Amino acid sequence: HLTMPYVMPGDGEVVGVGEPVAIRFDENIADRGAAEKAIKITTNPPVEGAFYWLNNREVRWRPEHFWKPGTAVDVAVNTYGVDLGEGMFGEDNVQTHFTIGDEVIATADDNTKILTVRVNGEVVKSMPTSMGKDSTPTANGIYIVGSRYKHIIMDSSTPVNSPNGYRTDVDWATQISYSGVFVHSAPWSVGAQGHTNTSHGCLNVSPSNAQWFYDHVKRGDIVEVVNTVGGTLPGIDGLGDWNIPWDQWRAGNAKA
Structure with missing residues (x-):
């Protein structure tokens, strides 16, 4: 009790x-x-x-x-x-x-396929990215940076051999949604980064860029995804709080 x-x-x-x-x-x-x-x-x-x-x-x-x-x-x-x-x-x-x-806001723009990191307004990194392919797109919206992992096996069974399912080991992984979106090293898609979306939703960047992100971006920094063909990150994802408009947030849900 x-x-x-x-x-x-x-x-x-x-x-x-x-x-x-x-x-x-x-x-x-x-x-x-x-x-x-x-x-x-x-x-x-x-x-x-x-x-x-x-x-x-x-x-x-x-x-x-x-x-x-x-x-x-x-x-x-x-x-x-x-x-x-x-x-x-x-x-x-x-x-x-x-x-x-400091204000750290990284914007992933599907029209340019670049993830731009701004620190107090200034561009400090421009990182080509490969985001979710059309059938498993990255949702637009505002993502709060969570935990970081030097390496992490992303096992969606948190079933792998099911339709849009997977199990992959990745390096330099920064969590940006509880739904399992990460910024992470994807040396296998460097060719595609900046050109073509190839992932299940994660923001693929170069090994160098992922490690930089891991080292420099901290919990509570912001990633904003824009212009993808996806939907919007849910407000109640766990790191999607800012997608709830203020009027609704402020009203709360204490009686629900």
């Missing part, structure tokens, strides 16, 4: 301008309003934000726009002993502090 909150990002971290505050519980929350009221977010410089639930165990908070670089964020999850509904109580408080880093 206890539930433990977990806050992201990590205490003392620096994150990109796309990073939401995330409070994830190890049980379904029956009273979402109770959880929201127990969570106090302090920003400096101060900016308005709001709560939106990705699912029954995880609430996010973000401002209307990407964070301003240098902002300091304090998160007080004051859930100890709080009645979260159906006889579940908060197991502990959590308290985190983080800061927002």
Whole structure:
């Protein structure tokens, strides 16, 4: 009858301008309003934000726009002993502090087949890319950079021998959606990068470019995909928060 909150990002971290505050519980929350009221977010410089639930165990908070670089964020999850509904109580408080880093926005434009990285507005890298082929296209939209992996076997069985299924080992992989979109090294498609889309949705770039991305792009930085033949990344993907328009985000879903 206890539930433990977990806050992201990590205490003392620096994150990109796309990073939401995330409070994830190890049980379904029956009273979402109770959880929201127990969570106090302090920003400096101060900016308005709001709560939106990705699912029954995880609430996010973000401002209307990407964070301003240098902002300091304090998160007080004051859930100890709080009645979260159906006889579940908060197991502990959590308290985190983080800061927002430089503005890093990478745009993958299917009309040019280039992934351009801008840091505080200036182009710092121009990376030819091969994105999802027409039958398995990369969705347009705004992606929040997540975790990074020096190498990772992307086994879609998280079934491989099924229609648009796969199992591949890749290097220098930066996660940009929970739906399994990565930026990663694809030495096999360098010829195609800048010209032809060949993937299941991942942003294929050169080994050099993928390692640069792994080294320089941090959690909370933004990738924007534009002009593909795909749909739009779902707002509730897990890293798709910004595809939910602010009016809808701000309204929340505490009663859903």
